[PDB]
């Protein structure tokens, strides 16, 4: 039997409450993080490294957590995925807090106190943004290159990944129009080594039993488009086989009517009866993916019919070319070659099924640190140094302060370490050690040495190529700073159930 | 359920310092400590709490018995002892639950001591010199503040400083040294204590003996006796020949405790010799040392070159009350304070407060080498130790840290026990010291303390809130080891 | 109450883990405890392969199940030793928990274990003597029919099966893709029989009705069509007129394109079939409906359901003419084997038992699918332990020189790998630990790499003479996988079970 609803009670309950939140998601910081698994409730378990979508497929019930994570989310929607960065820190923010709560410390004097470090940190972290932006980076990249490499290092897959690097980079250059993660995606292709995998300016999908009509089709079609359609394709007792009939022959008909090049169906088709589906003589699919269907109409230009023969003039329009090819030994399906093609599917071609997890969590964070760092001028080094730098300004200016804000500054500029903590534990090695080597030589020695993911040693990041731009590390701080002083802030709540 | 004894050896240490915590410093609440039997004791410092208080858990018996141990060296700080030991302990048991081996807090612990006990030796005070006179004014004043005698306060302060100067001694080994008996009181009839006169001699309050004694004598011996010159029915009545065999080997002035002669008139015109009665004993032992006279039982026998001199005698009135000036003998032992008044009843707060002064300026007088009082050197070494572990890198980085954040509960104590909010006047300390450091410049402001009468910070070298250095050293060595003992419990 | 959080979830993971791994562990070898096999309806099936265990087991803990699903998908590359997979699986957990007593991260323990598992790949490559010849290895084949048929009588007609499975693959091999398509389904499954009812018939055979009762089954014509057009006095009178007008225009049909056999799979007219008969063509009613591609497919012909597309280059083919005693007292059924070779053969069994038909068709697609890998890549290791003994050995002469923790995790690795001989001894009823240590000295002191398990209590532990062997190929995929399946489970922390509420 515990329970709490006064002012000081409530708000150690709101952020024990944040704090559990915050451990449901703690160790999966990191590049090469701890990996969950969580069951949707019907037997689907999922399984992601990601830290937003954990918070996103999670079930919130407490009041406090419910605003928390929806301020992560709210920061997910901005830049990439930095709630990591933030349900952790602001989590952390109230534990740090908790004591000085129950010493009786007002909230109000707490929201004033992180509210000045907060714009303390922001104005110090300009002092120390370094841009690069300028130094050969759209034209003789190889710092870009030398950047999105930094990312996967000490590993076998380095000679590769280097190809795959420039390759995804040139991509990025040609399809520089505020590129996402939907118009370019991976698939999934058995067999082949890792140097096979390449690049198709176009959907990828392979063929199955519902999903392509027949082979043959003209590939080197100067002009194919897309065709959707509403009506099925497929084949008083005796009152329906002249109405089958009909319809089977106008079926037939609308084919080389309509002139349509490809037809995408939302119906399965009957591969059984192949030589029935290539009567139509053109090209005929079924049980497209909306992905694929979003990817075509955009770029190439596909109409819509509705009709049993309803014709249109972007049935057989303008695109440039068609591909169909045997990918791997499987015949898959490219509708490349379109007037404004925004798209670039990354052709997965290797010999381990488990390496699309690999892929996974190794090249959309290429593609992500690539267009991070193209978007942005301004850096600081990662890997916990700024955290460091930060905690390292705000404690020694806590100590110029008298008042009751001294204490607090401090508590919020120790708090700021937990994130290269929680990097070394993740990686496995023990915080403290590297932690306190970290903290004496960057006092000391530098303004961004940093954890290794890699040898486990205190590290340059700024050498190693580690870029974190200012704004987004702003943002992020501001955000949880923002939560923390939102959670504090509510020492009341009310119910007013149904029964 | 219950685990990990240590936390269990660290709870009962942290219990038994929450017992004696508000006692802290001269403004400290009571304890009332109730034995088996009923009866109970009303004390403020904490020693004797200590010293009563049954401890029954074996952990905490270590922390009595190094407290007991340290009142055996000093005689202070058992109390600050205690509760540094247990912020040692807590703060420690928490680095042990995040994942650090005791082996390197222990060792941090070490390094960080020594390296207090190193940076206090090159920032304390040794200008309790003859040029230190306004410092020894306001401390007294300190000690005696909060008095409606505050308006003529500097009098009664040089007063008492120049009687506790005068009258120091110079022992075999050179250093200066002072009994606090040597001085004593003496009341008045009269006016108020504004027209108080340091007495240069012992003075006292009681008949006239006689009027025999010139303005200033050339040689006055002191024979103290203890018997009574009574005629009675080497003399079977000891009234002549014994007082003429004594000023036969030149006794001048010869002291009675007893009864008068009664035929003393005569023989006090040509010898000069004291008879006034009841002598006191606490006095005539101090008189004896002084002039370098021993008392004699029986005279029936040395007695020329051992007794005492004493330079002059002034026989005069000093506030409606006569007064004998046995003064500026061989050895400076012989003085005293006359308490002008009416009673020693109306005034006892009045000698409280005068002896309470002379205690805390013989404290600085012995020990030359003093510290800032009012918690100033626990906020400058929790300055220091902070920056000494940033510079180390090892695993007892964060041992050295806690060391450091733990060392502020002494002023925290203090200003809580002061009825003011303990994180202001902490804050403050902290930040002035802060500049003190990372600002050459403004180096004159290590001696910052806080005031427990106004509940703002103050500079204390200036004030006069002092303690030998010795004290604060031991204290925070005995600390430490009562911390390391503790930790290497499993 | 009560939570599972930190390490414990890895704790409960690695004991469902070890518990599916010990359930798995007793089937394994020739000399494995046979496991039959019960539905919730009742059905009863003994099957010592352990794909099907695995397949259609009941597992409730959610590690198990992404240990079963991700397991499942071994046998498409290669079909054996997917209980050698979990056996090294539950292994390596093992393992990975003894580690874990001492306190290593996962993390370390992950990449150790891949680190192994990359040198042990290395070194079986180095170690293997295997031929690159054997293409036409008819007579190797026997040998490896019979190691891959010697856990039952099987044996006793294996004489048999092995040239039946050559000249199989041999009507299957095709030097250019080296495939088996879906086509291609070499499965008959008779119930009943004898050891000599299963031999080599490369003709296709189908359970269905005759047309007459005495009908003359002798119809070597090519031309038989497909029908997929269903059965759809005065309504008599117009339905009788219906059936005569569709028989009219449907043997114009047949004049015209060619197509005499019309097999129909719905209802007609018995007046039909006989005046056919009369006019010297069959028609058989009620006929499967996928039974097109396979009877096409009998000399090069594909599916032609569309009445007009079974022209003369599609008709209804035939294999080869064979004509013997199909059924004494089953339904013999129609002749449809006269002309060529089909390049999807099918075989013809007739094992007496179901459980014979499922061992007989499981090995003959472990043959053909392994062969398969032999033409690929002609790369064998000797198995029965023996290669799991070297990569021990290895991993452990590794374990050495490394500074970090990763020695931990080369020596659990090895400790793992060493499981598979133990289990090979302890299925043969012998003491797993004398001889799997008797074996490992012998190999130590003896540079032979063939030195496994007599799991058959032959002569010798050495498989040169035994020729028990295995595609190379096939156990780095095998190790691999493993391997794979070890690190990413270790990585899981934590598993958060909706509408369990914690309370
Ligand atoms: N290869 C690496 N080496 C060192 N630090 C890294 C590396 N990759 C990421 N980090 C650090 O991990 C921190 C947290 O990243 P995280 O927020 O989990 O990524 P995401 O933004 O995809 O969620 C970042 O501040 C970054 O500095
Ligand atoms: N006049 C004063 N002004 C400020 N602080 C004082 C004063 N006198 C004593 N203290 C404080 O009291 C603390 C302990 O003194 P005390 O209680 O007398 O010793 P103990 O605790 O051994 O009995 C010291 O740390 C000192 O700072
Ligand atoms: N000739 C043989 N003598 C002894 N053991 C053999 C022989 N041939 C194969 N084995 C054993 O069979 C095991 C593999 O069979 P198994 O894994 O049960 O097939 P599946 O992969 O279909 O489950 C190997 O561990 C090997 O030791």
Redesign the interface.
């Known amino acids: 039997g515990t329970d709490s609803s006064q002012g000081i009670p409530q708000l150690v309950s709101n952020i024990s409450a944040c704090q559990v939140i915050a451990?449901?998601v703690r160790?999966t910081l990191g590049p090469?993080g701890?990996?969950?698994?969580?069951?949707?409730?019907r037997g689907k378990?999922t399984?992601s490294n990601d830290g937003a979508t954990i918070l996103k497929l999670?079930?919130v019930v407490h009041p406090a957590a419910k605003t928390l994570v929806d301020i992560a989310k709210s920061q997910d929607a901005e830049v990439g995925d930095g709630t990591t960065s933030v349900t952790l820190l602001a989590a952390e923010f109230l534990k740090q807090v908790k004591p000085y709560v129950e010493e009786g410390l007002h909230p109000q004097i707490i929201i004033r106190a992180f509210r000045t470090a907060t714009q303390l940190a922001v104005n110090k972290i300009k002092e120390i943004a370094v841009t690069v932006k300028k130094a050969d980076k759209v034209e003789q990249r190889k710092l870009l290159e030398k950047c999105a490499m930094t990312a996967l290092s000490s590993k076998l897959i380095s000679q590769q990944k280097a190809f795959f690097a420039k390759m995804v980079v040139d991509a990025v250059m040609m399809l520089d129009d505020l590129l996402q993660l939907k118009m370019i995606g991976i698939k999934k292709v058995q067999g082949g080594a890792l140097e096979d995998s390449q690049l198709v300016a176009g959907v990828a999908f392979k063929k199955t039993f519902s999903y392509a009509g027949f082979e043959m089709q003209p590939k080197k079609y100067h002009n194919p488009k897309i065709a959707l359609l509403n009506v099925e394709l497929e084949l008083d007792?005796?009152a329906?086989?002249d109405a089958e009939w009909n319809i089977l022959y106008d079926k037939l008909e609308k084919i080389h009517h309509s002139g349509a090049k490809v037809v995408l169906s939302k119906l399965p088709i009957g591969d059984?009866?192949?030589?029935?589906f290539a009567?139509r003589d053109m090209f005929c699919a079924g049980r497209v993916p909306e992905e694929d269907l979003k990817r075509t109409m955009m770029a190439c230009g596909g109409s819509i019919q509705t009709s049993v023969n309803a014709l249109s003039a972007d049935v057989l329009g303008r695109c440039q070319v068609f591909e169909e090819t045997q990918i791997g030994?499987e015949r898959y399906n490219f509708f490349t070659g379109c007037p404004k093609a925004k798209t670039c599917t990354f052709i997965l071609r290797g010999g381990?099924?488990?390496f699309m997890?690999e892929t996974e969590r190794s090249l959309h964070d290429a593609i992500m640190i690539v267009r991070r760092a193209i978007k942005n001028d301004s850096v600081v080094a990662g890997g916990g140094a700024i955290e460091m730098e930060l905690s390292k300004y705000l404690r020694d200016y806590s100590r110029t302060i008298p008042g009751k804000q001294q204490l607090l500054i401090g508590a919020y500029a120790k708090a700021l370490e937990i994130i290269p903590r929680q990097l070394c534990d993740?990686?496995?090695?023990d915080a403290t050690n590297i932690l306190n080597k970290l903290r004496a030589r960057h006092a000391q020695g530098g303004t961004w040495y940093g954890v290794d993911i890699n040898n486990e040693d205190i590290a340059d990041n700024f050498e190693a190529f580690v870029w974190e731009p200012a704004m987004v590390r702003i943002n992020a701080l501001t955000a949880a700073s923002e939560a923390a002083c939102l959670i504090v802030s509510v020492d009341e709540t009310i119910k007013n159930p149904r029964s | 359920t219950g685990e990990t004894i240590r936390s269990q050896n660290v709870m009962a240490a942290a219990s038994i310092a929450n017992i004696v915590k508000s006692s802290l410093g001269p403004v400290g609440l009571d304890k009332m400590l109730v034995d088996d039997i009923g009866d109970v004791t009303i004390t403020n410092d904490g020693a004797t709490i200590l010293k009563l208080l049954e401890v029954e858990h074996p952990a905490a018996k270590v922390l009595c018995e190094l407290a007991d141990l340290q009142d055996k060296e000093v005689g202070d700080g058992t109390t600050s002892v205690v509760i540094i030991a247990a912020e040692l302990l807590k703060n420690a048991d928490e680095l042990v639950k995040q994942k650090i081996h005791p082996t390197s807090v222990i060792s941090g612990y070490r390094l960080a001591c020594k390296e207090a006990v190193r940076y206090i030796n090159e920032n304390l005070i040794v200008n309790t010199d003859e040029l230190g006179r306004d410092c020894l004014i306001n401390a007294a004043k300190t000690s005696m503040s909060s008095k409606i005698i505050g308006i003529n306060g500097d009098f009664f302060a040089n007063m008492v400083v120049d009687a506790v100067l005068a009258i120091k001694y110079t022992d075999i080994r050179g250093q200066p040294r002072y009994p606090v008996n040597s001085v004593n009181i003496l009341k008045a009839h009269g006016r108020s204590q504004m027209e108080s006169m340091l007495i240069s001699g012992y003075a006292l309050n009681c008949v006239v003996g006689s009027q025999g004694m010139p303005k200033r004598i050339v040689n006055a011996k002191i024979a103290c006796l203890d018997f009574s010159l009574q005629k009675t029915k080497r003399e079977s009545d000891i009234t002549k020949e014994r007082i003429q065999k004594i000023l036969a080997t030149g006794a001048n002035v010869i002291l009675t405790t007893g009864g008068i002669d009664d035929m003393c008139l005569k023989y006090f015109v040509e010898a000069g010799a004291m008879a006034v009665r009841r002598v006191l004993k606490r006095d005539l032992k101090r008189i004896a040392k002084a002039s370098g006279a021993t008392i004699l039982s029986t005279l029936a026998n040395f007695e020329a070159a051992m007794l005492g001199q004493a330079e002059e005698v002034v026989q005069e009135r000093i506030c409606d009350d006569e007064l004998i000036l046995i003064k500026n003998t061989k050895a400076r032992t012989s003085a005293s304070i006359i308490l002008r008044g009416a009673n020693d009843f109306m005034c006892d707060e009045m000698e409280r407060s005068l002896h309470d002064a002379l205690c805390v300026v013989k404290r600085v007088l012995e020990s030359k080498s003093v510290v800032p009082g009012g918690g100033a050197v626990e906020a400058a070494l929790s300055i220091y130790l902070e920056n000494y572990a940033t510079s180390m890198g090892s695993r007892e980085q964060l041992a050295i840290a806690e060391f450091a954040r733990s060392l502020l509960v002494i002023p925290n104590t203090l200003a809580v026990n002061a009825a003011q909010d303990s994180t202001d006047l902490v804050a403050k300390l902290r930040a002035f010291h802060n500049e003190a450091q990372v600002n050459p410049e403004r180096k004159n402001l290590k001696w910052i303390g806080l005031d427990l009468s106004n509940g703002k910070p103050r500079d204390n070298k200036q004030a006069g809130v002092f303690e030998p250095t010795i004290v604060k050293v031991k204290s925070l060595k005995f600390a430490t080891e009562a911390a390391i003992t503790i930790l290497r419990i499993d | 109450k009560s939570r599972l959080?930190g390490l414990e979830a890895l704790k409960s993971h690695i004991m469902a883990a070890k518990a599916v791994a010990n359930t798995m562990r007793t089937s394994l070898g020739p000399n494995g405890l046979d496991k039959m096999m019960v539905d919730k309806d009742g059905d009863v099936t003994v099957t010592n392969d352990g794909a099907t265990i695995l397949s259609m087991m009941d597992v409730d803990h959610?590690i198990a199940?992404?240990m079963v699903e991700?397991s499942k998908?071994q046998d498409d590359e290669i079909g054996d030793g997917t209980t050698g997979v979990v056996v090294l699986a539950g292994a390596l957990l093992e393992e990975a928990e003894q580690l874990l007593d001492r306190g290593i991260?996962?993390?370390?323990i992950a990449d150790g274990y891949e680190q192994a598992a990359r040198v042990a790949i290395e070194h079986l490559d180095k170690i293997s003597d295997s031929v690159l010849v054997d293409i036409k290895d008819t007579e190797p084949l026997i040998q490896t029919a019979k190691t891959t048929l010697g856990s039952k009588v099987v044996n006793s007609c294996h004489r048999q099966m092995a040239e039946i499975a050559v000249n199989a693959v041999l009507t299957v091999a095709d030097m250019e893709?080296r495939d088996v398509d879906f086509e291609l389904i070499k499965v008959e499954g008779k119930v009943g029989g004898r050891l000599e009812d299963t031999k080599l018939i490369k003709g296709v055979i189908v359970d269905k009705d005759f047309s007459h009762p005495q009908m003359p089954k002798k119809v070597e014509d090519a031309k038989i069509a497909i029908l997929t057009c269903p059965f759809?006095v005065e309504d008599y009178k117009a339905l009788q007129k219906?059936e005569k007008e569709k028989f009219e225009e449907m043997i114009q049909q047949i004049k015209e394109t060619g197509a005499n056999l019309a097999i129909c799979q719905w209802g007609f007219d018995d007046e039909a079939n006989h005046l056919l008969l009369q006019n010297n063509l069959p028609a058989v009613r009620w006929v499967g409906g996928?039974e097109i591609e396979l009877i096409a497919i009998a000399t090069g012909g594909?599916?032609?359901?569309?009445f007009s597309?079974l022209t003369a280059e599609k008709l209804g083919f035939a294999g080869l003419v064979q004509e013997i005693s199909f059924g004494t007292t089953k339904d013999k059924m129609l002749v449809i084997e006269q002309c060529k070779n089909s390049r999807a053969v099918t075989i013809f069994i007739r094992g007496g038992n179901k459980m014979i038909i499922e061992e007989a068709k499981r090995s003959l697609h472990d043959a053909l699918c392994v062969i398969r890998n032999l033409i690929r890549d002609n790369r064998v290791v000797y198995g029965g332990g023996a290669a799991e003994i070297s990569c021990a050995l290895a991993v452990s002469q590794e374990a050495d020189k490394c500074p970090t923790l990763e020695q931990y995790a080369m020596r659990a690795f090895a400790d793992a790998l060493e499981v598979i001989p133990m289990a090979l001894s302890e299925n043969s009823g012998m003491n797993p630990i004398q001889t799997m240590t008797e074996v490992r000295a012998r190999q130590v002191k003896e540079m032979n790499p063939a030195l496994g398990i007599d799991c058959l209590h032959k002569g010798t532990n050495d498989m040169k003479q035994q020729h028990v062997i295995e595609t190379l190929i096939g156990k780095k995929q095998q190790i691999?996988?493993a391997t794979?399946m070890v690190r990413?489970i270790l990585?899981?922390?934590?598993?958060?079970?909706?509408?369990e509420s914690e309370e």
């Open positions: 451990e449901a160790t090469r701890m990996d969950k698994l969580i069951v949707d409730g378990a399984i999670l079930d007792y005796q329906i086989v059984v009866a192949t030589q029935y009567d030994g381990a099924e488990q997890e993740n990686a496995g090695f | 959080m959610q199940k992404l991700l998908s991260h996962p993390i370390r893709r759809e219906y996928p594909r599916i032609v359901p569309r597309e691999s996988l794979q990413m990585k899981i922390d934590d598993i958060r079970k909706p509408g």
